[PDB]
Design a protein around this ligand. Structure first.
Ligand SMILES: CCCCCCCCCCCCCCCCCC(=O)OC[C@H](COP(=O)([O-])OCC(O)COP(=O)([O-])OC[C@@H](COC(=O)CCCCCCCCCCCCCCCCC)OC(=O)CCCCCCCCCCCCCCCCC)OC(=O)CCCCCCCCCCCCCCCCC
Ligand SMILES: CCCCCCCCCCCCCCCCCC(=O)OC[C@H](COP(=O)([O-])OCC[N+](C)(C)C)OC(=O)CCCCCCCCCCCCCCCCC
Ligand SMILES: CCCCCCCCCCCCCCCCCC(=O)OC[C@H](COP(=O)([O-])OCC[N+](C)(C)C)OC(=O)CCCCCCCCCCCCCCCCC
Ligand SMILES: CCCCCCCCCCCCCCCCC[C@@H](O)O[C@H](CO[C@H](O)CCCCCCCCCCCCCCC)COP(=O)(O)OCC[N+](C)(C)C
Ligand SMILES: CCCCCCCC/C=C/CCCCCCCC(=O)OC[C@H](COP(=O)(O)OCCN)OC(=O)CCCCCCC/C=C/CCCCCCCC
Ligand SMILES: CCCCCCCC/C=C\CCCCCCCC(=O)OC[C@H](COP(=O)(O)OCCN)OC(=O)CCCCCCC/C=C\CCCCCCCC
Ligand SMILES: CCCCCCCC/C=C\CCCCCCCC(=O)OC[C@H](COP(=O)(O)OCCN)OC(=O)CCCCCCC/C=C\CCCCCCCC
Ligand SMILES: Nc1ncnc2c1ncn2[C@@H]1O[C@H](COP(=O)(O)OP(=O)(O)O)[C@@H](O)[C@H]1O
Lengths: 54, 98, 459, 320, 49, 99, 347, 54
């Protein structure tokens, strides 16, 4: 009795990583909202030295 | 055309092929990029000296200046990438997808 | 033509500056006034066309189509005001603006004196139509329908643009008078074959030709009432008008390249009538009837005789009026029960008598009942096709039989029988709906009284 | 003129404007504590501007006229309904929590803008960084869902990762039995229906997560009810907090310029509060959205820009 | 007084209004003078008047 | 449920509030005047006046003129023994055929 | 980044482009390109994040390789002619090197991947500046050296650009990637018409720049970087969505909008040179661009997607910052078809 | 209605063309964003341009 409008299913169709998903593209993820990726836990690996005894 | 120009152009071609074929390091590709401009400098000065283009002798100096400007830019990008990922590997520059 | 073009461009500010409760009244009154003004173009000459200026001209073929457009606008306004009561004032004004823009583009299309300007305008008619369909359609399929319509038309029309610019480069002008007085025979070659294909295929897609028609059921079924009215009445006639205008320079190659299109049109006319026999949707039934009638028009244009052009013009006008009326009737019944299934609502003859009378008259005009202009055009086309060959009579007779069968089947299913027991929201027919039907039907009978006004330049 | 890059190059500098007392102080506590009185007294004695708790209709108070709008047009949530029927099937609990988080984010942006453009300190009755305790209490009581918690975490990350932490965090610690006694004495039935575990979960979140988290950023003051009732000692303790190990000493004129540009743009502040995550609690259908937006535009002073509303008494529109 | 906070465009920016109106008037006057001079120069060059 | 969506409203009947409604608008006065303007302009003005205008349009197609010209030509040709219809549209003297 | 530093970097980018467009010496043209790249990199890396850093790195590598190839072409042309003035190059090998270097700078296929990658990496303002200016300069050089361009290579690269842009934009859902593929397709059109009428190339460049500026300003106004983010704009300011829908219709080439004029004039000019298959294929391939424009238009304007609850507060607040010339860009990108014969003035 | 109008006339023009466009779009956009890969592609393109075009 009223004009049809898009719903959550339509929005989820239009809101994937890419249109027409494949295996690799389904393995893909959408980018972060503020384009800032979470920092990686890179280990500093400071040099270790033996100052002495000789 | 003498064979010296042949060797210089071959050197430029080798340096260009080296840049277009990465292995692991962004630093090695920067080194290949610096070699291309070295070959360009040598070719340009060999052409200019042979033909006695007196006013053209200042062109290779400007070429070197902008070569090392590009080198500085590449080193800055490399240090930022290294700080981000822990290694200068080009495999980590894959967040953006074509 | 400015005395008709400018009043529409003034209708736009009137719509956007009127009060919220007076938009429909103002638009309807001034659309009727513009139609009355545009009735003057029917005074045509017997030797040449009416050349107003270097840009716009009118002919015995352009005049009836312009009058039909100007008369059709207020009917679309009435139907839209029926089904758009709950919309906001801004969106009502936007809808009226879309209708006004479509009418303006159609007027400029039918009056354009140059092929490239005609192309630009008849392509410009897509944007308001696409917006109307994909924005104010009711079902989920309006998006797919709009995509199909747009891409069919554009895939047809882009090679037409290439052909037009190539013709301009080769000959020096795309002005219709120049290309008619300076026309030269088209030699039998692959290049000329593909130029012919480009032009004719663009207009066949616009017609639509059988095998290129799916966009028509998709768009007509899923468009709002005004969109459905304008799609069948006028927008389908752009292809026929273009083919009548463009075939001046395509001879004598048309005598040999018309066979596939003639076979497609005849057999697809039969096929679409048979489809109408077994349709579970009323709008789809009307759309396929439109397909059959336009296939008959295609046959007439392709056989290309002075007797076929007159019948083609008469059939175009009559089909426009009849299809608009049928779409309006279907829309009224849809507004009653909120569903397009044909067998859902029955007994409407005993629930709504005068609406049943309107249904009967519309169905009688849909089939070729003499002396209606539908019959005049169909009979002229049938006679011209008989002169072309003597089995076209077999095909036309089969088509006429199936046409009567499906028209009366629609009438009996919708009106006769016993009413549905559980449907109890069928209120008495509105004065607005009855006036809409009367304004649809009376001009048809008046044109039956005076038939030479819609027989084209060949009369 | 309005603050911008041209003003920055002209010479308006946040560090120049600061007067060594421009401090952000947030008073926190459990439900029905004396934190409001403590914040009022601290703001009055230290001369700082007081921002009460960012409840519903705070955005109504800061825009248009001060009068709050209808609940249907602002928030679409009820604290009374949350108290009466916490486990509603219409998502009222998480709608209320997300709206309150957005309100707190807006209030923090306003307070930062005031501090940066005036130099005066601000005393908030609650902040962004203490809002999650209610979310944790709601989740551990089963009032909301894990998807709601995840959406809240995403929004909180992408929004609050951009603003500076408060200078001073003053927490008033009150045991749960005293909280319930104060609630009983207050007499409001809706909060009288609050269970004991829900009050306990807020305290657990405050003590185990919020206080340890904010202690690393800067110094945190913890007071009991008796200590908080005497605000003179609280103000004296605040005045002698010379230590500052937060990012405020590290901030520069360019960073302050970026922060001021961000906080003065409210649409840029609330940019990520509406991200396309279609939770049933917060998602609103097309028809309801259109009808509510039409009503909001039909409101008296909302159809056009603030300077261009004729019906509220704006003149010279044709030359504006 | 309807808004709790003073709107940015509560009062007309009279400097901007004056600049806009003056610029419009100056441009129209310059265009009229330019058209007059162009017509006169065309007449002079083609020997009409 | 997955949204906060309004329920589909019941269909509205114009006859409920206005028993004598023409179906144009909710407001009775605007509805009546819309009906009046539509009926008057459309039916009376357009139908009657345009139809009589088309009926009395001047003979610019030269049907009557062509009939009179044909009558004169038939009279002249039959009064002098000439054929009623010429065998050539143009003059073979003025047409120069190639050799 | 300091505002003075940002504005001086922008002015340095523009200075490099102007040096390229006014220089008559190949060395000075190369200097202009180098200065443009050097000042452009920090503009891309203004908003620091891993994505911005990666986009800047890829763009720098591509532009450095292209500049090296361009300098090699200059040196080779000098060897066989002893000339530095920018005219018809005197060596076919030098011309091929120069054409490939300039195509790589412009992002023409098969040198296109960096365009969507960098555009998705960088912000909206950075993408706007990138597309507009970095297409403005190399096309100026190509127009200068058009008379010696190899038609076969140029048309092959143009057709590849059109096809690849259409397909990529068809697949993508991110607005910046869609804009990048649209840029690729329009670059294909312009470079296809280049070896016949540089005036038509400039006309298409102007129309494309206007439409891209309007679209990017609208995206900045809506603060949307994805399709779903754009799907909420109708509930906050439906005017922006309607204007963007009209602009999208224009970008697809639908008459009577401004976007039809470049395609129309290019088809006419290319047909004048007895070429029909290429204009027909180019016209037919643009339907992919129109399809994904229409798909974007369905989500944003012609339909109403679900909204959220904080959109009420977004309603309560107002857009403070103004992007001047946006109405002018919207008008000029939709309603300048009747003013077509001004291309003679452009000539 | 079914076999011709709803099945085969749909299969020939609109469905086959759309399927081809979708497949080609997936093929073009299915890139992992590896500079090594598309720079090797650049090298192949440069060699092809140098040799094939004369
Ligand atoms: C006084 C009131 C208070 C201050 C108001 C702001 C202005 C302050 C001074 C200033 O310029 O600040 C901006 C900025 C410094 O402030 P900021 O805080 O860094 O601004 C950050 C963002 O730009 C701020 O983000 P944004 O969204 O405001 O972006 C601003 C800017 C971002 O764009 C740019 O900065 C320039 C981009 C140019 C792209 C190409 C344009 C079209 C070229 C066509 C070529 C022919 C065809 O412009 C746009 O986004 C669109 C503006 C129209 C562009 C098209 C014009 C066509 C003619 O300076 C500049 O951008 C450079 C100004 C000079 C450029 C031209 C030099 C010659
Ligand atoms: C992989 C399977 C694909 C199956 C595709 C099937 C498509 C079928 C529908 C389209 C073709 C219809 C052919 C009908 C049969 C008659 C053909 C005919 O008259 O040929 C002789 C005709 C006429 O040749 P002719 O034999 O009369 O010539 C003799 C005359 N002289 C001596 C002067 C040469 O041939 C042509 O017309 C050739 C040009 C045809 C150009 C292509 C357009 C045809 C129609 C396209 C319609 C597209 C929409 C419908 C399909 C979707
Ligand atoms: C030598 C002379 C030859 C004849 C010349 C004739 C010249 C006539 C000049 C005067 C014409 C204008 C006055 C009459 C207008 C019609 C009024 C009427 O009949 O109302 C009765 C009818 C019936 O009236 P009613 O039903 O409301 O009233 C019945 C009586 N009571 C009050 C008791 C209920 O009016 C209507 O139905 C009103 C409908 C709307 C009318 C809007 C009119 C607008 C103004 C006129 C515009 C005309 C444009 C025509 C098109 C352009 C030109 C071709
Ligand atoms: C309830 C009971 C119903 C039945 C009874 C009703 C009342 C009795 C009516 C009986 C009518 C029976 C038919 C008799 C008609 C007599 C009048 C008719 O013969 O005149 C025609 C008049 O024809 C008209 O031209 C028909 C008008 C056509 C109007 C077309 C539509 C008008 C505009 C509508 C806009 C819609 C546009 C639609 C697309 C174009 C003949 O034309 P013509 O012999 O030469 O006129 C002679 C005058 N001359 C010599 C100067 C020429
Ligand atoms: C192409 C053009 C060719 C030339 C055309 C020339 C003719 C020009 C046509 C003029 C248009 C005629 C007016 C159009 C209809 C106006 C509709 C109208 O009257 O409005 C209704 C109107 C007012 O609105 P409300 O219904 O009250 O709504 C209240 C909401 N709270 O209703 C009323 O109450 C009015 C009742 C008394 C008014 C009677 C008017 C009768 C009509 C004749 C007036 C026109 C004068 C004649 C001028 C002739 C000029 C040639
Ligand atoms: C298979 C059926 C057709 C497939 C259509 C695929 C669309 C792109 C096809 C590319 C064009 C195919 C060749 C068309 C013939 C052509 O290009 O030239 C035609 C001719 C030759 O010109 P000259 O160079 O002067 O000849 C030399 C004289 N000494 O020039 C013209 O007539 C211009 C007309 C342009 C027509 C081009 C396209 C028309 C063919 C399509 C059929 C109709 C469109 C059907 C729509 C469906 C879309 C698949
Ligand atoms: C001359 C050679 C031409 C080379 C190709 C140039 C383009 C030719 C015409 C192509 C028109 C563009 C059609 C778009 C194709 C891509 C559509 C697609 O990938 O999806 C298929 C999509 C539905 O699939 P879903 O993914 O499930 O729905 C969600 C959609 N986002 O289908 C559609 O919606 C489009 C259907 C209508 C478009 C085609 C209409 C008929 C085409 C004209 C017939 C003549 C063709 C000429 C050859
Ligand atoms: N984020 C939130 N989620 C749910 N409820 C909240 C939130 N923030 C505040 N409230 C409610 O608002 C009310 C504010 O009361 P409060 O001002 O703390 O009382 P008092 O001033 O006596 O301390 C509390 O009952 C609390 O439950």
């Amino acid at each position: 009795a009223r004009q049809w409008q898009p719903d959550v299913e339509w929005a989820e169709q239009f809101g994937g990583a890419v249109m027409y998903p494949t295996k690799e593209t389904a393995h893909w993820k959408p980018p972060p909202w503020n384009d800032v990726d979470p920092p990686k836990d890179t280990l500093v690996s400071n040099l270790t030295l033996n100052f002495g005894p000789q | 055309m003498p064979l010296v120009y042949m060797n210089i152009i071959m050197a430029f071609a080798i340096a260009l092929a080296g840049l277009l074929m990465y292995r692991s390091h962004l630093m090695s590709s920067l080194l290949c990029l610096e070699g291309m401009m070295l070959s360009l400098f040598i070719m340009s000065t060999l052409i200019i000296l042979n033909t006695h283009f007196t006013l053209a002798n200042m062109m290779p100096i400007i070429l070197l200046v902008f070569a090392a400007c590009e080198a500085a830019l590449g080193l800055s990008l490399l240090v930022m990438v290294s700080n981000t990922y822990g290694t200068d590997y080009v495999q980590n520059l894959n967040l953006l997808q074509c | 033509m400015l005395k008709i073009i400018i009043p529409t461009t003034m209708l736009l500010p009137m719509t956007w500056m009127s009060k919220h409760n007076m938009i429909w009244i103002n638009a309807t009154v001034h659309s009727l006034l513009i139609s009355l003004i545009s009735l003057s173009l029917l005074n045509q000459l017997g030797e040449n066309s009416l050349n107003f200026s270097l840009t716009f001209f009118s002919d015995s073929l352009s005049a009836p189509l312009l009058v039909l457009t100007t008369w059709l606008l207020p009917l679309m306004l009435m139907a839209s005001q029926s089904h758009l009561s709950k919309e906001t004032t801004t969106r009502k004004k936007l809808y009226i603006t879309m209708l006004i823009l479509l009418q303006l583009f159609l007027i400029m299309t039918f009056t354009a004196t140059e092929l490239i300007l005609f192309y630009i305008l008849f392509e410009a008619t897509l944007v308001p139509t696409l917006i109307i369909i994909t924005r104010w359609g009711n079902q989920t399929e309006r998006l797919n329908a709009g995509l199909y319509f747009l891409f069919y038309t554009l895939a047809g029309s882009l090679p037409l643009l290439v052909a037009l610019v190539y013709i301009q480069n080769t000959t020096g002008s795309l002005n219709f008078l120049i290309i008619h007085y300076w026309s030269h025979p088209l030699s039998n070659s692959w290049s000329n074959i593909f130029m012919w294909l480009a032009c004719i295929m663009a207009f066949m897609v616009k017609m639509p030709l059988y095998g290129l028609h799916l966009w028509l059921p998709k768009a007509h079924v899923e468009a709002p009432i005004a969109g459905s009215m304008v799609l069948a009445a006028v927008l389908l006639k752009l292809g026929g008008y273009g083919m009548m205008r463009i075939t001046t320079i395509l001879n004598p190659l048309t005598n040999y390249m018309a066979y596939p299109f003639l076979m497609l049109s005849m057999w697809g006319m039969i096929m679409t009538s048979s489809i109408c026999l077994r349709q579970t949707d009323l709008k789809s039934l009307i759309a396929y009837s439109s397909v059959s009638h336009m296939a008959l028009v295609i046959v007439a244009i392709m056989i290309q005789t002075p007797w076929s052009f007159m019948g083609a013009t008469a059939l175009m006008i009559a089909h426009g009026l009849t299809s608009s009326m049928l779409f309006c009737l279907a829309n009224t019944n849809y507004e009653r029960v909120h569903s397009r299934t044909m067998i859902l609502a029955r007994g409407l003859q005993t629930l709504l008598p005068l609406m049943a009378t309107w249904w009967l008259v519309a169905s009688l005009t849909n089939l070729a009942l003499p002396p209606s202009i539908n019959l005049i055009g169909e009979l002229f086309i049938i006679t011209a096709s008989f002169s072309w060959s003597n089995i076209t009579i077999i095909l036309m007779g089969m088509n006429m039989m199936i046409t009567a069968l499906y028209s009366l089947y629609m009438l009996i299913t919708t009106q006769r029988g016993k009413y549905t027991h559980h449907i109890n929201n069928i209120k008495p027919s509105f004065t607005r709906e009855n006036a809409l039907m009367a304004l649809h039907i009376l001009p048809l009978l008046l044109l039956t009284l005076n038939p030479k006004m819609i027989l084209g330049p060949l009369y | 003129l309005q603050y911008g890059p041209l003003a920055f190059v002209l010479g308006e500098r946040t560090t120049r404007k600061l007067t060594e007392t421009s401090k952000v102080i947030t008073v926190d506590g459990n439900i029905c504590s004396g934190k409001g009185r403590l914040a009022r007294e601290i703001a009055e004695k230290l001369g700082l501007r007081h921002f009460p708790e960012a409840g519903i209709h705070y955005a109504d108070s800061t825009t248009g006229d001060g009068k709050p709008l209808d609940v249907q047009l602002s928030g679409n949530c009820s604290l009374e309904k949350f108290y009466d029927d916490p486990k509603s099937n219409d998502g009222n609990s998480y709608r209320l929590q997300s709206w309150l988080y957005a309100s707190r984010l807006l209030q923090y942006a306003d307070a930062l803008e005031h501090l940066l453009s005036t130099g005066q300190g601000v005393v908030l009755e609650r902040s962004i960084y203490s809002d999650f305790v209610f979310l944790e209490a709601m989740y551990r009581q089963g009032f909301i869902r894990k998807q709601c918690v995840e959406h809240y975490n995403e929004v909180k990350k992408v929004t609050a990762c951009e603003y500076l932490p408060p200078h001073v965090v003053v927490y008033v610690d009150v045991p749960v039995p005293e909280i319930q006694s104060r609630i009983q004495k207050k007499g409001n039935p809706h909060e009288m229906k609050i269970t004991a575990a829900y009050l306990q979960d807020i305290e657990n979140a405050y003590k185990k997560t919020f206080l340890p988290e904010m202690s690393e950023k800067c110094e945190v003051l913890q007071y009991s009810a008796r200590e908080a009732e005497d605000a003179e000692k609280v103000v004296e303790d605040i005045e002698y907090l010379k230590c500052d190990k937060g990012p405020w000493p590290d901030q520069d004129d360019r960073t302050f310029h970026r922060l001021r540009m961000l906080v003065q743009n409210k649409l840029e502040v609330l940019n990520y509060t509406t991200i396309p995550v279609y939770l049933p609690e917060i998602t609103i259908g097309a028809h309801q959205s259109d009808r509510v937006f039409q009503k909001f535009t039909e409101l008296p002073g909302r159809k056009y820009s603030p300077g261009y509303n004729e019906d509220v008494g704006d003149k010279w529109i044709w030359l504006k | 007084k309807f808004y709790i906070r003073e709107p940015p465009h509560g009062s007309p920016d009279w400097l901007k209004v004056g600049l806009t109106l003056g610029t419009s008037v100056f441009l129209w006057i310059y265009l009229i003078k330019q058209h007059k001079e162009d017509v006169l120069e065309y007449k002079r060059r083609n020997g009409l008047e | 449920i997955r949204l906060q969506e309004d329920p589909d409203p019941e269909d509205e009947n114009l006859y409920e509030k206005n028993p004598d409604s023409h179906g144009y608008d909710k407001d009775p006065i605007v509805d009546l005047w819309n009906m009046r303007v539509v009926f008057f302009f459309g039916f009376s003005i357009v139908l009657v006046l345009g139809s009589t205008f088309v009926a009395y349009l001047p003979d610019y197609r030269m049907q009557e003129w062509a009939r009179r010209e044909a009558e004169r030509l038939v009279k002249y040709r039959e009064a002098n023994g000439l054929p009623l219809m010429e065998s050539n549209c143009f003059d073979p003297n003025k047409i120069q055929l190639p050799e | 980044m300091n505002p003075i530093i940002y504005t001086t970097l922008i002015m340095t980018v523009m200075s490099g482009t102007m040096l390229v467009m006014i220089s008559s010496h190949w060395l000075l043209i190369w200097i202009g390109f180098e200065m443009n790249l050097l000042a452009m990199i920090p503009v891309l890396m203004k908003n620091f994040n891993p994505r911005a850093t990666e986009a800047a790195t890829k763009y720098f590598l591509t532009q450095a390789t292209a500049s090296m190839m361009l300098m090699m072409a200059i040196i080779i042309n000098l060897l066989y002619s002893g000339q530095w003035t920018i005219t018809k190059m005197f060596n076919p090998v030098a011309m091929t090197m120069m054409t490939m270097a300039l195509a790589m700078k412009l992002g023409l296929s098969p040198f296109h991947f960096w365009v969507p990658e960098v555009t998705q990496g960088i912000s909206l303002q950075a993408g706007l500046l990138l597309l507009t200016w970095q297409k403005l300069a190399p096309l100026s050089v190509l127009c200068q050296i058009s008379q010696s361009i190899n038609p076969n290579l140029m048309l092959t690269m143009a057709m590849l650009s059109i096809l690849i842009g259409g397909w990529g934009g068809l697949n993508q859902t991110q607005l910046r990637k869609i804009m990048a593929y649209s840029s690729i397709a329009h670059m294909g059109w312009m470079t296809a018409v280049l070896p016949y009428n540089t005036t038509m190339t400039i006309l298409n460049l102007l129309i494309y720049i206007t439409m891209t500026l309007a679209m990017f300003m609208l995206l900045i106004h809506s603060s949307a970087t994805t399709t779903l983010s754009l799907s909420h704009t109708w509930n906050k300011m439906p005017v922006i969505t309607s204007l963007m829908m009209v602009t999208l219709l224009s970008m697809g080439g639908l008459p009577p909008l401004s976007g039809f004029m470049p395609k129309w004039m290019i088809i006419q000019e290319m047909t004048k040179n007895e070429s029909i298959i290429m204009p027909t294929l180019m016209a037919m391939t643009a339907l992919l661009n129109l399809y994904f424009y229409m798909r974007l238009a369905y989500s944003s304007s012609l339909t109403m997607f679900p909204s959220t609850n904080n959109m009420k507060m977004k309603w309560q607040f107002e857009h403070t910052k103004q992007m001047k010339l946006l109405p002018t860009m919207i008008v000029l990108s939709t309603l300048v078809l009747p003013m077509t014969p001004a291309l003679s003035s452009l000539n | 209605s079914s076999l011709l109008d709803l099945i085969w006339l749909e299969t020939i023009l609109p469905k086959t063309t759309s399927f081809i466009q979708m497949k080609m779009s997936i093929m073009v956009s299915n890139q992992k964003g590896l500079i090594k890969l598309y720079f090797l592609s650049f090298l192949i393109t440069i060699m092809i341009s140098m040799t094939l075009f004369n």
